[PDB]
């Protein structure tokens, strides 16, 4: 059910930083647990991950600094709605 998305404008793309967006009614406790689960499953595969921020208030989820290789593993995690690769925004 979970899908991956990245910016269509290739020079504006920021690989290595991902926004994991969870289901509409996912609670903050579940969001943090899903982030720690990702870190645990990624540590077993020999990959180092960093949870930069945990989202709550508007959308449930978290900001993770990890290798793209873990995306398939991350899309399989519970409560995951979609994952988006971070991208640049510019002053108009």
Which residues are at the interface with a second copy (CB under 8 A)? Answer: 5, 7-9, 12, 14, 17, 19, 21, 52-53, 55-59, 63, 82, 84, 86-92
Gap between the Cα atoms of 92 and 25, Å rounded = 34
**CB-CB contact of 11 with 90 (8 Å):** no
Tell the smallest beta-carbon distance from residue 31 to a second copy (Å). Answer: 13
Select 46 or 90, whichever has its Cβ closest to a second copy.
90
Supply the minimum distance, in Å, between the C-beta of residue 46 and a second copy.
25
Phi, psi of 14 (to 5 degrees): -125, 80
Per the document, the length of the chain is: 92
Closer residue to a second copy in complex, CB, 3/45: 3
What strand order describes the sheet that includes 61-65? 13-22, 61-65, 50-55
Q: How far is the CB of 49 from a second copy (least distance, A)?
A: 15
């Amino acid at each position: 059910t979970a899908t991956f998305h990245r910016c269509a404008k290739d020079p504006w793309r920021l690989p290595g930083t991902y926004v994991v967006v969870l289901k509409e009614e996912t609670h903050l406790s579940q969001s943090e647990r899903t982030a720690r689960r990702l870190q645990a499953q990624a540590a077993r595969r020999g990959y180092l991950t960093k949870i930069l921020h945990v989202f709550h208030g508007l959308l449930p989820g978290f900001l993770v600094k990890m290798s793209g290789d873990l995306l398939e593993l991350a899309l399989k995690l519970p409560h995951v709605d979609y994952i988006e690769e971070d991208s640049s925004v510019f002053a108009q």
